[PDB]
Design a protein around this ligand. Structure first.
Ligand code: ZN
Lengths: 144, 150, 60, 49
């Protein structure tokens, strides 16, 4: 059925939803802690998402770190939130709810499974095509 | 030398994004004192407790060390260069993700709109020519605000 | 002639929900499915089909 | 082709599974080449042809 067979599920899928929340904020100490968990990393610490009143990183910034740095998967937020269209178009106040990533950087959008895999328009299928199985497997192990 | 990208003093139209809002983040609606340009922005209310109708000072700079390049990172906490206005109450690092306009009308492009993202934080700026020198780019802009509850 | 004419008028069934808009015809002439009670790893979804102009999509 | 295509699909659905998503590929070139709507679009159409 020209579709991916892999699928991140349950606890992992739920925390990912939790992780995409707007209220997600990180500390520098924990960023180093998170960085070591990485199966692979550039060795170059990223710039804080916030500088004042105090330096901070966002979970979307950090999720995008996990993401390979020259590939994108667009729009299929596939979540109930917003408005069976028409409404989210009201007025392109177009973020958060709907999913969008650019240059391996997540702009907005709570994640779903249709994004996460075993379906058309999934990030998993295009990574397989561009990054290939070997890069995609290391990304997948890393994210989990 | 400190080629600032943008600077203006803004007024709060709204602090209540369509009522429903969110917990640690909230989206403000503002308008420039020229009352020709307006702004909507997601903010951390917990670290910057906004009031409605407040008079804010807003500055935007794609760089910190005088005008030279720095669009990198290990953001180096140990910098000692007075190059940063830092003196503003609130600072953010981000990208421009979307630009609106309308050039199909013939030259038009008449009421240009810019949309910006600071770590996912959405922003919308509207204006005929205030954004005539800017455009959508990867993360580079620094947004600085003060004059809270003036 | 009326009663024998009436005998086609509704076959024997129905459903229609009229909730989800269809981007192919703006009219919310849609049908909805309740399926995938358990299935495998695929999440149970609500499937929506537009009768007119034949469109089908999922809750996800 | 458009005239022919009406014959092929009486259902009128243009959404079909096909190889090589050129849109994503074309889009990636834009992501790579950094083409934007506020930049000129220098092109030789015959070369395209
Ligand atoms: Zn329809």
């Amino acid at each position: 059925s020209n579709r991916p067979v892999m699928g991140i599920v349950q606890d992992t899928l739920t925390a990912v939803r939790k992780f995409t929340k707007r209220d997600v904020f990180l500390e520098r100490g924990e960023v180093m802690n998170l960085l070591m968990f990485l199966s692979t990393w550039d060795g170059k610490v990223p710039q804080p998402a916030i500088l004042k009143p105090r330096p901070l990183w966002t979970g979307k910034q950090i999720f995008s770190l996990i993401i390979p740095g020259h590939i994108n998967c667009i729009r299929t937020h596939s979540t109930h939130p917003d408005d069976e269209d028409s409404g989210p178009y009201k007025h392109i106040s177009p973020g958060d709810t709907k999913v969008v990533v650019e240059n391996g950087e997540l702009i907005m959008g709570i994640l779903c499974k249709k994004s996460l895999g075993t379906s058309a328009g999934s990030l998993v299928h295009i990574s397989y095509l561009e990054m290939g199985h070997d890069i995609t497997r290391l990304f997948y192990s890393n994210i989990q | 030398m400190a080629g600032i990208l943008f600077e203006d003093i803004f007024d709060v139209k709204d602090i209540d994004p369509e009522g429903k809002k969110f917990d640690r983040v909230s989206r403000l609606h503002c308008e420039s004192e020229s009352f020709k340009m307006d702004l909507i922005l997601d903010v951390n209310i917990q670290i910057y407790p906004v009031d409605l109708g407040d008079k804010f000072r807003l500055v935007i700079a794609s760089t910190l060390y005088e005008d030279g390049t720095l669009d990198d990172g290990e953001y180096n906490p140990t910098d000692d260069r007075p190059s940063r206005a830092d003196q503003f109450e609130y600072v953010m690092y981000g990208k421009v993700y979307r630009i609106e306009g309308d050039e199909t009308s013939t030259e038009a492009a008449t009421r240009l709109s810019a949309y910006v993202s600071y770590g996912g934080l959405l922003m919308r700026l509207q204006g005929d020519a205030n954004n005539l020198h800017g455009f959508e780019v990867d993360s580079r802009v620094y947004l600085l605000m003060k004059k809270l509850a003036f | 002639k009326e009663a024998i004419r009436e005998h086609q008028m509704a076959k024997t069934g129905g459903t229609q929900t009229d909730l989800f808009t269809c981007g192919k015809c703006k009219k919310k002439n849609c049908t909805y499915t309740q399926v995938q009670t358990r299935s495998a790893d695929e999440p149970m979804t609500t499937f929506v089909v537009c009768n007119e102009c034949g469109n089908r999509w999922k809750f996800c | 082709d458009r005239e022919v295509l009406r014959v092929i699909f009486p259902t009128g659905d243009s959404k079909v599974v096909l190889p090589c998503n050129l849109l994503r590929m074309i889009w990636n070139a834009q992501k790579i080449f950094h083409i934007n709507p506020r930049l000129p679009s220098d092109l030789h159409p015959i070369k395209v042809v």
